[PDB]
Amino acid sequence: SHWTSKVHESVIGRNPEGQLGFELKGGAENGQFPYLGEVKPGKVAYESGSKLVSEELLLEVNETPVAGLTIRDVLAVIKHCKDPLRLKCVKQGGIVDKDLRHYLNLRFQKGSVDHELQQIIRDNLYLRTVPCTTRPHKEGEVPGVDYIFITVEEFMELEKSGALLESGTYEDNYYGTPKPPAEPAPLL
């Protein structure tokens, strides 16, 4: 019944080349969970615990939640984690799907394990996104940092084209979060 009911921990090591044995797909820049490519038996160096089916959603790496991040950021987390890599995953099927917009529209009971996870995933998504809003700019706000200030017509165009991962309304205005960009601007 719960979204988290099939969650499990799989512990792996990196291959001689330094790879995981499978590819990572998805990520928030594509509106998705990070999820595994095809998992071919024999390619993953498992240590001990449960194994992985193809295309499981990746939720945490060595206790750092990565669901809600871009693929770049997920891979950066893995780069700084030391073997063994404890991966929290859940297989796709039923109510569990890689689509982040569908997932963020699910309403879980407050305080439930499903709810706590959803809010962690939202915090990750908020790390690399600026919300858009149709309400006017206010004193002290930096356009493009606090908000993207757009018209209602623009907002609805973003909704219709699937660019928004979540949206809502409050005091006569629309609020929403678009997908983060695939590659961020270099910092150094």
Partner: peptide, 12 residues
């Protein structure tokens, strides 16, 4: 960045 109170109320 961190969402404001109005945002959180909107997407609850």
């Amino acid at each position: 960045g961190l969402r404001s109170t109005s945002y959180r109320r909107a997407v609850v």
